[PDB]
Design an enzyme around this catalytic site. Structure first.
Site, short mmCIF file in Angstrom:
data_model
loop_
_atom_site.label_atom_id
_atom_site.label_comp_id
_atom_site.label_asym_id
_atom_site.label_seq_id
_atom_site.Cartn_x
_atom_site.Cartn_y
_atom_site.Cartn_z
N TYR D 26 0.83 -1.20 0.00
CA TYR D 26 0.00 0.00 0.00
C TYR D 26 0.87 1.25 0.00
CZ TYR D 26 0.95 0.95 4.94
OH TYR D 26 1.56 1.25 6.13
N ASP D 37 3.79 8.07 4.26
CA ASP D 37 4.43 6.77 4.28
C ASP D 37 4.01 5.98 3.06
OD1 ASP D 37 5.48 4.04 5.47
OD2 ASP D 37 3.32 3.78 5.19
N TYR D 82 -6.70 6.17 14.93
CA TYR D 82 -6.02 5.94 16.21
C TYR D 82 -6.78 6.58 17.37
CZ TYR D 82 -2.47 5.60 12.54
OH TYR D 82 -1.78 5.32 11.38
#
Lengths: 432, 434, 279, 107, 289
Positions: D26, D37, D82
């Site tokens: 990914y 990222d 999160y």
């Protein structure tokens, strides 16, 4: 230009010319582990590398936790106590000393009051002394600075009064050579440090103000314990250290007398009674519902130091070794003669009874009586018939208590009977 | 003596004399100018350090710093200048910077005296409550870090956030970063009491976090066919062309793979490889004025404008693409594999001119099917539409060009192409006359 | 663009100080700052930055220092600290070490040899930004060293070929801005034992005839001195290993000879401590 | 919780199950085109196992729809993320996330 | 290299560092100039064919060392340590006596010119501090060391003595003082008492006399302790030899201070505490014999 370049250049040139020098310097660092213990050595090397990495930087809140975790990991090490030479040549003690300097910093601040690494490391480094005493010899050099910064408060036993003196005590545990290597200036330093504990106490426990913990004060006993360790040996009393210690202690009066008048003090016949009337029924403070043991424990420690400081008679020199003068001086410190009545009293009161009633908190300890009888044996002794005709026994009340306290009970026994048994074991007055 | 707003002619206010005294004092604390010999430089440094230590001991056991703080009553730009005399803080910034520089120089000394500026909170927060100059604080923090690092525990999260916020409301000056470098390890001289706390605290603020991009390079391809649409004298309004792709493997380098078959606005979009605050764009459907068509997604300026259509997939092997053009009624529909997709585009750049273009990335193979023998149409054109062949000029052959860039990859020849967008210079329009 | 900073002086200083701040924040070992920095700069970006030729000298040195401080900082520092211990274990494979590879007493190649010392464990981490309790780690990403060594060797060969010609226009900025970070990276990769035997042979053959023959500035000389010190330290380590390898056999022979002679008066006869022990 | 916008054809028969590792390549992406990222520049597979909740639940909720060999565009609600503050240092608080998860092999 | 050492010593530190490179190179130079054996060695060799050549080679080596500014380096390194006894000071003094062997005059002139043109004050204060930091016989330490592990060296802790902390260092320092003042150098003899060009005056003569008095008192106390015994121990022999050598070196240094006719130095000697030291020495000798 760039003098660091020429410095490194000539360092490299000299080091490559004098290969023998590098060979002799590198060899003491080398060690040799055999076979199976490679795995347990790798973990120790990783832990020491982590400690060295944290050495250059300082410690904060989580860093103390990380260091304590690393120390707990390094304690369960097989080759930690099996290769003392590797431990010494690996330079851990220097790392711990540098960490201590970093923690203390300038001093008189105490940003973090949690010394637990230092005590554990020092005790585990000084427990073994039959092999590789050079570690203790190395710590003897650091002993001067270690005594210089003897701060108060140790987190491991939750006592105060002397933080790093455990390291010194472990350094002079059972080494006659190390005790003989002690000098005068550090003894003067500890004497002046002890002389500063003459201030009176108003509350149960207070340094300057705002008390926090008032369980038990011990701030005056650690110096006496260190002096006792530095003046005695495994089975011998070093006269060279004893003379200078007693001269320094007698040169100035430092023991405050809360019941006598004039200069000097040190009156057992009143201070002991004051302690046993202020600590038995009330608490450590004066006004308390129905000082404390600190004053009496300090007096017992001073008595033990004085008794072990007295030269041994009829063993090496008996009246022809200058010990007569120091014996007369010790005798001159009578109140000191009349301590048999002090040793006679038994201010414990076992209480107990039928409805459980366990645990004691303000009980007189037989170790203090053992200290009195040790001082009597060391100074006066029972070599004359007068003492036997005056006493006829090590004690009437303690012996009657020991005779009465003989039963198969889990509550009446195993709480005070062990201390009485140890005190009777340590009583050698009827002997010789 | 004139703090309590007293009458000016009663006691003199010699601004010129105090300015001269300050200038003489600052030139009196000159750095040793190390370009000269080592002996004289070392003598000057030793004399300066001894002088600063003695001045410290004489001065701010109980004084000097209090006098300087009482002197710092300048909290308004020009109100206090007008109230007391003609002007008061004409050169407050320079004298403040020089005073803090001399203070830090005094604090340095023989590396054995750092108490007042490194063991207190009120003076540090008085320094931090203004935040106009950063030379003094950097010098004192660097000197403390060199001698013994104990002034960083005073710096809390609030001070760090205040210093970072200086980069937000006030423009960058490269001195804030040089200060934050001094609040770190600095190659060995670090303390984890609070410096690591604030180092970890630099991150969640996200006012210091920076974003970097890495995109593949793409180019735009256009043929020689020019529509030349005008107003009033228009000729043709319908066109139809198709293209084929065979090798279209993705993931060659990263997700940044560009393959667009639609058109982009001539005005607003230019063949420029970078530029712009909003990541610029060097392809079709990259800028805000374009739309693009990869078959699935129609973003413009990082805005989600995807369409919905049955059987959504990439332009894989054996997938036809068709285009429709209209000028009177804006109605553009795209058909793939015989099925038209949604996303009808209305009111395009009618005013002006536009050209057929296509963007491509590395590792791609595309064929042009305009009509005739050169281009074989896979599917039949829609009714009412014409192939892209009738706009062929005489006495020339149609081909492809370099899309008005500067220079391609040439080994030996190094030619320079001047300003020539198309065949003309002023406007790209025909010439109907009467 | 990316290369337009060669004209704008202020923006170049801004970016250089940003790189310096990135290097300074994550240094001397850190837990979570290294991962957050690796979020901003990735492996291909760093590889292109270090492999580019037209990149400005300041940004090149900044990116090199950033890469070293992120990846090769903690492990290299730990190895440098441990490099003065010389702990040689005794196993069955530690006896086949000689001072010379042959009987001709040849000096041999300092880099290539058999160590059998106690090297630390090379344990990297694979967080992928979705994990927990990632504190004990060495490298936040997984650098492919197989291509990194080849890239370093290729760039070093290109640099020495360019410096042999003594071109008027250097690679980046000047003659030292292109050469100091390259040697810094090569040195901090060589001290960690990353290079294999063939790479060590290539490096030694690179400077045997030469890298030290042309004119170099001061920092390049500093890096050369550091490399020579590391080589001499490796030679000392090989000598110590050979000495202890011989010493094992010598002390075994001495113990055998002492066991041959019968001299025991203690009650516990035929004890192991009678050979070599204080008590 | 998550919206699945498929961007690649999928067979629709093979589905990821519980108790086995899944290889996913990914590329994360924040809002308005920012990213933080990527898991393909490292040229390494990303294998995770279902059951211990070692990964965020957004991936688990988003991988239950698409099949093997199918690339999809994912969006993560800040509630399913999160938390209120997210990951400190790479995720801003109360911000959605964009992913390009793709299944290649199932073991 | 000499410039590097001089600029390292000139920069203030308020602390004596290790500087292993300086130690190694000072040892290298001292061993380079130490060609002579200073003993009998071979038989009676002829004293002009080889003696002149040896003197010429020593002069050439000293010229090679000090033409680069070794004397200024030695003076700066001595003045760097503010009266603190350290191994670096020992290495510097070894280098000084290595380059001052044979009573060389060019190096003495160079040092005097440097000290006059620089108005150095830390050199004499450092010398006074080094003299005050010197060691004595330390009778109490010897008494403690005699009784170890019952009797003797049963513990086998090490080969150390801990009875004279600095004896080779003291001998080297006083040999440096004697060589620096050798040759009846009148101006240098007067420069150690007056320091007319210097703002602060330090009297090396009184410090030397005080050190002589201290070692005389130490020797007398050792004799008074040992008067009750009859046999000489090996440790007693070594301590006696070391004390005698130190006293002989101090006496030689005092002779070289007033060897030439110097009225000021003679009056300073006369008004000092020399006579008590000589009285103690005579009292020691009358029973030593």
């Amino acid at each position: 230009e760039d003098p660091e370049l020429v410095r490194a250049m000539f360092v490299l040139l000299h080091r490559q010319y004098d290969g023998i020098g590098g060979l002799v310097r590198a060899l003491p660092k080398t060690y040799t582990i055999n076979g199976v213990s490679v795995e347990d050595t790798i973990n120790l090397l990783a832990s020491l590398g982590q400690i060295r990495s944290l050495l250059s930087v300082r410690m904060g809140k989580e860093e103390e936790k990380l260091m304590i975790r690393g120390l707990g990991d390094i304690m369960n090490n097989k080759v930690f106590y099996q290769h003392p030479n590797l431990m010494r040549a690996l330079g851990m003690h220097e790392t711990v000393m540098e960490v201590m300097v970093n923690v203390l910093g300038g001093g008189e601040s105490k940003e973090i009051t949690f010394p637990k690494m230092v005590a554990n490391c020092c005790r585990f480094l000084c427990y073994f002394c039959r092999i590789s005493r050079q570690n203790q010899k190395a710590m003897f050099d650091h002993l001067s600075y270690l005594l210089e910064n003897s701060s108060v408060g140790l987190a491991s036993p939750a006592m105060r009064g002397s933080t790093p003196l455990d390291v010194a005590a472990a350094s002079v545990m059972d080494n006659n050579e190390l005790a003989l290597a002690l000098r005068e200036p550090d003894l003067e330093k500890v004497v002046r440090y002890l002389a500063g504990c003459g201030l009176q106490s108003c509350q149960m426990l207070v340094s300057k103000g705002y008390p926090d913990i008032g369980w038990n004060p011990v701030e005056g006993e650690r110096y006496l314990d260190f002096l006792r360790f530095a003046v005695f040996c495994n089975g011998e009393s070093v006269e060279e250290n004893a003379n200078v210690v007693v001269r320094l202690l007698i040169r100035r009066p430092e023991c405050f007398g809360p019941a006598l008048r004039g200069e000097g003090g040190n009156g057992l016949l009143a201070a002991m009674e004051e302690a046993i009337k202020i600590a038995e029924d009330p608490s450590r403070d004066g006004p308390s519902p129905t000082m404390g043991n600190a004053i009496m424990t300090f007096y017992a420690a001073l008595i033990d130091l004085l008794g072990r400081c007295a030269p041994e008679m009829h063993l090496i020199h008996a009246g022809k070794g200058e010990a007569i003068r120091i014996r007369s001086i010790l005798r001159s410190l009578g109140d000191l003669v009349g301590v048999i009545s002090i040793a006679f009293q038994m201010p414990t009161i076992a209480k107990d009874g039928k409805v459980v009633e366990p645990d004691m908190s303000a009980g007189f300890c037989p170790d203090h009586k053992a200290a009195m009888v040790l001082f009597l044996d060391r100074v006066y002794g029972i070599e004359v018939q007068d003492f036997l005709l005056h006493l006829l026994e090590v004690g009437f009340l303690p012996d009657l208590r020991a005779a009465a306290s003989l039963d198969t009970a889990a509550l009446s026994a195993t709480d005070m009977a062990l201390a009485l048994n140890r005190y009777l074991c340590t009583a050698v007055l009827p002997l010789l | 003596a004139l703090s309590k707003k007293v009458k000016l002619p009663t006691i003199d206010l010699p601004i010129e004399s105090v300015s001269l005294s300050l200038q003489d004092l600052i030139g009196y604390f000159h750095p040793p100018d190390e370009h000269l010999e080592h002996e004289d430089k070392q003598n000057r440094l030793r004399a300066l350090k001894n002088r600063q230590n003695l001045f410290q001991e004489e001065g701010m056991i109980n004084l000097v710093l209090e006098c300087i703080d009482r002197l710092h009553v300048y909290s308004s730009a020009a109100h206090f200048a007008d109230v007391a005399g003609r002007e008061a803080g004409e050169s407050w910034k320079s004298i403040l910077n020089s005073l803090y520089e001399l203070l830090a120089a005094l604090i340095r000394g023989n590396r054995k005296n750092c108490a007042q500026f490194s063991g207190s909170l009120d003076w540090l927060i008085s320094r931090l409550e203004r935040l106009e100059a950063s030379s003094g604080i950097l010098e004192v923090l660097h000197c403390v870090l060199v001698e013994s690092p104990e002034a960083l525990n005073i710096i809390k999260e609030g001070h760090i956030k205040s210093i970072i916020s200086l980069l937000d409301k006030h423009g960058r000056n490269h001195k804030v970063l040089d200060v934050l470098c001094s609040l770190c390890v600095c190659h060995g001289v670090a303390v984890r009491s609070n410096q690591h706390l604030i180092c970890d605290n630099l991150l969640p603020g996200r006012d210091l976090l920076l974003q970097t991009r890495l995109v593949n390079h793409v180019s735009s391809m256009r043929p020689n066919i020019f529509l030349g649409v005008s107003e009033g004298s228009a000729q043709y309004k319908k066109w139809y062309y198709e293209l084929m792709v065979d090798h279209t493997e993705p993931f060659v380098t990263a997700e940044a793979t560009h393959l667009r078959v639609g058109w982009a606005s001539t005005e607003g979009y230019s063949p420029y490889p970078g530029g712009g605050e909003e990541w610029g764009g060097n392809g079709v459907g990259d800028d805000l004025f374009s739309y693009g068509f990869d078959g699935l997604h129609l973003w413009s300026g990082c805005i989600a404008r995807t369409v919905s259509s049955p059987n959504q997939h990439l332009l894989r092997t054996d997938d036809v693409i068709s285009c429709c053009l209209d000028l009177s009624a804006p109605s553009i529909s795209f058909r793939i594999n015989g099925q038209p997709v949604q996303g009808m585009f209305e009111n395009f750049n009618i005013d002006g001119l536009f050209f057929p273009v296509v963007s491509f990335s590395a590792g791609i193979k595309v064929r042009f099917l305009l009509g005739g023998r050169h281009g074989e149409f896979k599917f039949l054109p829609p009714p009412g539409y014409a192939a892209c062949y009738e706009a062929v000029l005489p006495k020339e052959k149609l081909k492809v060009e370099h899309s008005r860039e500067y220079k391609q990859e040439r080994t030996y020849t190094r030619d320079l192409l001047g300003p020539t967008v198309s065949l003309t210079q002023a406007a790209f329009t025909p010439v109907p006359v009467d | 663009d990316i290369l337009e900073l060669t004209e704008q002086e202020e923006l170049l200083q801004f970016h250089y100080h940003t790189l310096r701040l990135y290097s300074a924040v994550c240094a001397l070992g850190n837990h979570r700052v290294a991962h957050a920095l690796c979020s901003h700069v990735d492996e291909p970006q760093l590889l292109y930055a270090i492999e580019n030729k037209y990149m400005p000298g300041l940004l090149r040195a900044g990116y090199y220092d950033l890469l070293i401080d992120i990846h090769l900082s903690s492990y290299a520092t730990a190895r440098l600290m441990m490099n003065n211990e010389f702990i040689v274990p005794m196993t069955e494979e530690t006896k086949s070490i000689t001072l010379f590879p042959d009987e001709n007493k040849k000096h041999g190649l300092p880099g290539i040899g058999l160590s059998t010392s106690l090297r630390p464990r090379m344990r990297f981490s694979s967080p992928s930004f979705v994990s927990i309790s990632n504190d004990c780690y060495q490298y936040s990403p997984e650098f492919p060293l197989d291509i990194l060594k080849a890239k370093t060797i290729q760039m070093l060969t290109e640099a020495v070929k360019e410096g042999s010609l003594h071109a008027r226009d250097p690679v980046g900025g000047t003659t030292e801005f292109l050469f100091v970070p390259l040697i810094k990276l090569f040195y901090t990769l060589l001290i960690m034992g990353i290079f294999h035997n063939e790479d060590l042979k290539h490096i030694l053959q690179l400077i045997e005839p030469g890298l030290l023959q042309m004119k170099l500035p001061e920092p390049v000389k500093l890096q050369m001195c550091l490399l020579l010190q590391y080589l001499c330290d490796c030679q000392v380590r090989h000598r110590i290993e050979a000495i202890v390898a011989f010493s094992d056999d010598f002390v075994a022979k001495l113990q055998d000879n002492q066991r041959f002679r019968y001299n025991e008066v203690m009650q516990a006869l035929n004890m192991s401590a009678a050979l070599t022990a204080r008590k | 919780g998550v919206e699945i916008e498929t961007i690649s054809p999928g067979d629709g028969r093979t589905f990821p199950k519980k108790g086995q590792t899944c290889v996913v390549h990914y590329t994360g992406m924040l809002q308005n085109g920012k990213k933080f990222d990527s898991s393909r520049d490292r040229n390494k597979p990303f294998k995770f196992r279902i059951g211990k909740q070692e990964v965020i639940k957004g991936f688990e909720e988003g991988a239950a729809q698409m099949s093997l060999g199918q690339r999809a565009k994912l969006t993560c609600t800040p509630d399913v993320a999160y938390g209120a503050t997210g990951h400190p240092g790479v995720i801003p608080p109360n911000a959605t996330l964009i992913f390009d998860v793709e299944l290649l092999n199932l073991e | 290299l000499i410039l590097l050492f001089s600029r390292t010593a000139l920069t203030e530190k308020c602390k004596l560092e290790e500087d292993f490179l300086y130690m190694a190179y000072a040892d290298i130079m001292a061993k380079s100039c130490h060609d002579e054996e200073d003993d009998d060695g071979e038989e009676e060799v002829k004293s002009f064919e080889e003696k002149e050549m040896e003197k010429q080679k020593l002069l050439y080596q000293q010229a090679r060392l000090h033409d680069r500014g070794a004397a200024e380096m030695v003076l700066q390194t001595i003045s760097a340590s503010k009266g603190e006894t350290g191994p670096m000071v020992a290495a510097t003094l070894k280098l000084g006596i290595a380059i001052l062997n044979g009573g060389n005059s060019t190096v003495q002139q160079k040092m005097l010119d440097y000290l006059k043109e620089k108005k150095d004050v830390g050199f004499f204060q450092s010398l006074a501090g080094l003299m005050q930091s010197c060691s004595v016989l330390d009778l109490n330490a010897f008494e403690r060391q005699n009784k170890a592990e019952g009797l003797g060296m049963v513990t086998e802790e090490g080969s150390g003595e801990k009875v004279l902390q600095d004896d080779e260092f003291t001998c080297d320092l006083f040999r440096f003082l004697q060589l620096l003042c050798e040759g009846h150098n009148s101006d240098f003899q007067n420069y150690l008492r007056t320091q007319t060009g210097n703002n602060t005056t330090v009297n090396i003569i009184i410090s030397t006399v005080d050190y002589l008095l201290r070692v005389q008192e130490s020797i007398s106390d050792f004799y008074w302790y040992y008067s009750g015994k009859d046999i000489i121990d090996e440790q007693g022999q070594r301590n006696f030899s070391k004390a005698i050598q130190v006293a002989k070196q101090v006496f030689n240094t005092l002779t070289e201070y007033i060897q030439g006719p110097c009225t000021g130095n003679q009056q300073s000697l006369a008004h000092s505490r020399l006579w008590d030291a000589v009285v103690g020495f005579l009292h020691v000798f009358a029973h030593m014999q």
